[PDB]
Structure formats: C-alpha cells, structure tokens
C-alpha cells in the first residue's frame, strides 16, 4: 500500500558544457507485508506422565 511522499526538488544539470537539462527527484514510501515459511516442526505431545506427591502428617 501507499504511505507518503517526500519533497519534489527540481534540478538543472549541465551537459557537455553547453546546455542545462531539467530534472527532478522524489522518494515515495510504501507499506508491505512479507510472509515466510518455517523449515520444520517439533514433535506432538502424544503421551503425558505426571508424578504427584501429597505430603501429610499421618504417614
């Protein structure tokens, strides 16, 4: 997408020491969005094991 624009400067440039050539220059700024793809994946979680310890005073 388009964002903004800079100042437009008009210039005169000598050529072969005989003539002045008309020119101009500007900078136009755009927005963009870039997408890239990973090189792999991790393994899934198929099985989960959890250990539990319940501290109590009776034993």
């Amino acid at each position: 997408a388009y964002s903004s624009t800079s100042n437009i400067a008009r210039m005169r440039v000598p050529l072969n020491q005989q003539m002045f050539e008309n020119r101009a220059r500007t900078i136009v700024t755009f927005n963009a969005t870039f997408v890239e793809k990973d090189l792999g994946t991790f393994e899934d979680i198929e099985h989960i094991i959890i250990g539990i310890d319940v501290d109590n005073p009776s034993g």
Partner: protein
Amino acid sequence: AYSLLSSRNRLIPRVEVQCRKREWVKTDPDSPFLNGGREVLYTPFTAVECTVQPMRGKAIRDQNNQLMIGGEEDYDSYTVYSETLLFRAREGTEHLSDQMLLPDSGGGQTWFTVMKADMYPSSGVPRYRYYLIAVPVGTEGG
C-alpha cells in the same frame, strides 16, 4: 654584454599597440570613506613594438565562452612580448594597472589588464614579457 638582443629584430614581424594609464579619485564630499564615489583617470600612450600570442592549453578556465547559471559568459587572455615598460598596481597609492587594447575572439576589440610582468634586471637589455586578461564585458575592470 648582450649585443644582438639589444637591437630590434629583423625577421619576425612586430606591431605597435595602444595603452592607457589608470589612476583613481574620490568624489563624494561628505562620505567618510577612502572609496567615496571612485573614478578612474586615463592617459593614453602606445607600445613601441609587441608580439601577441594566445594560451597554449585547453584547460576549462582558458576556454573563451563559459557556461554559468546566468548565461554563456566571455573570457580571453594573451601573452605579450614588448620593449615598453608597463606597470602593475602599487599599494598605498592611487595608481592602477595599465591596460592595452587588443582583438578578441568575438571579432571586436577590448581592453586587457596587465597582471604579471617579467624583468631581468641583471641582463640590461629592455625586453619584457607580460600576461594579460580581458576586462569583464560591460565594465572597466578594477
């Protein structure tokens, strides 16, 4: 002592040229400045015999018509050998540099101002070499 060079040449043609001395004067009655309204006083004269030659190279500052942001300005110069004494400006005085009238590249005639004078005090013969630059078009120099 030199003998042959102490006499006028008899093979290469030589010509005479016209010149004019230059002073300056203050005109404003009340201005406190040395400049005032400057004026230049002239007194004409001629050189006995001279030889005129152009610049030898093609350097950008030696070209005749030059391109500036305003327009194609004008420039000329020469090298002159002469048997007349011409003087440059001297400081703390009211004397200015001598000028002499020569043909230009545009077909007209204009005044050239002496900038460099060469002398050989120990030799004796009165032969000199000068280097001249054409006065800016539309003015009488400085």
